[PDB]
Each structure stands twice: as C-alpha cells, then as structure tokens.
C-alpha cells in the first residue's frame, strides 16, 4: 500500500492597514505692550558778575570763628587786601627817544589803612557757657605806588670738611771749621 497527498496553488493578497495620520503638533505666540518715559529738569538762565574799580580792591571774606568748647553763633566778616594799579607815569614834559639813565624796575603795591576791631559771640552746649572772642580784622586800605632800591641777599646753605696727617723729618745742618794760621816774627841783624 502507498500514501499520497493533494494541495492546491496559493496567492498572497494582503489587505494591510497601517496608514498613521495624527494630529498637527506646534505653538504660536504674539507680543505687544508699551511704556512712557519721563525727564523734565529745571531751567534758568544764566548770569555773571564783573568788577574793576581803581586802587587796591577790598576782598570781603566770610567764616566761622570757635574758641573752645563753644562756637560763634554767627560767621565772622574778614577784609583783605589785594588789587592792582598803573605806575603812574607823568611829567612835565614828557621825554624819551633813545637815550635814558635811570633804573628800569617798576614795582607795584597797597599801603594798609585803619583797623576794625569785632566781638564775636561763642555759644556753649547744655553745660558750659557762651563767650566771647576779638578779632582785629582790616577796616580799610589804600593802593599807594612805591620805588624800592634794596641790593645783596642770601640763600642756600651747603659746605664741607677734609682733614689729612702730616708728617716728615728735620734738616740735618753739619759743617765743622778749624782755626788754623800761621806767623813769621824771626827778625835778623
């Protein structure tokens, strides 16, 4: 006996289904806003004071003066002295081409004038008490030409010192004499 089998063809024909089509995925976003800003200075114009007058100016100078434990309950006022003025130049006749002789040093300065005496009054904290202080301080002053004729002057200061031996030896002065003569006296007849 024998045993035998029977099949067919075969045909593949898949119907499949894998078609993945999700959904979009991403972001947009917008800005907009606004802010002010702020600047408005002060104005004012501008100015400038000027001042010449002749002979030697008064400097008004202002400051507090302190004495102790205490302090001026007010700023003290100080003059000084100080400006500038011409040599004063005129004669009679008024001459010079191109001959002179005299010295050509011009000089400028202000004589000083009356004082003022002022009493300031110091105050004390809780303790102590007020008191008061002078201060001769200029009252006025006056610009008065004035032609010098001093000479010579010094400065400076700068020197030095060396100090060497010495030494050495006498003279030797030798000399020796003798007295030595001779005499005839032998008369004859």
Same mark, same amino acid.
């Given at each position: 006996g024998w045993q035998a /089998?029977?099949?067919d063809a075969t045909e593949i024909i898949p119907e499949l289904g894998e078609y993945p089509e999700p959904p979009p995925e991403l972001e947009n976003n917008k800005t907009m806003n606004r802010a002010e800003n702020g600047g408005r200075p002060p104005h004012h114009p501008f100015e400038t004071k000027d001042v010449s007058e002749y002979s030697c100016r008064e400097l008004h100078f202002t400051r507090y003066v302190t004495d102790?434990? +205490? #302090? =001026?309950?007010?700023?003290?006022?100080? %003059?000084? +002295? =100080?400006?500038?003025?011409? *040599? $004063? &130049?005129? %004669?009679?006749? $008024?001459?010079?081409?191109?001959? !002179? !002789?005299? *010295? @050509?040093?011009?000089? /400028? &300065?202000?004589?000083?004038?009356?004082?003022?005496?002022?009493?300031?009054? %110091?105050? +004390?904290?809780?303790?102590? $008490?007020?008191?008061? #202080?002078?201060?001769?301080?200029?009252? =006025?002053?006056? +610009?008065? #030409?004035?032609? #010098?004729?001093?000479?010579? @002057?010094?400065?400076?200061?700068?020197?030095?010192?060396a100090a060497r031996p010495q030494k050495g030896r006498k003279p030797r002065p030798r000399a020796r004499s003798a007295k030595a003569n001779q005499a005839e006296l032998e008369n004859a007849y």
């Open positions: /089998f029977k099949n102790g434990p +205490c #302090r =001026s309950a007010k700023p003290v006022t100080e %003059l000084v +002295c =100080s400006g500038q003025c011409g *040599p $004063a &130049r005129l %004669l009679p006749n $008024a001459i010079g081409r191109g001959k !002179w !002789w005299r *010295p @050509s040093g011009p000089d /400028f &300065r202000c004589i000083p004038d009356r004082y003022r005496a002022q009493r300031v009054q %110091l105050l +004390c904290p809780g303790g102590e $008490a007020p008191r008061a #202080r002078k201060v001769r301080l200029v009252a =006025s002053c006056k +610009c008065k #030409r004035l032609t #010098r004729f001093h000479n010579q @002057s010094e400065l400076k200061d700068f020197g030095t010192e």
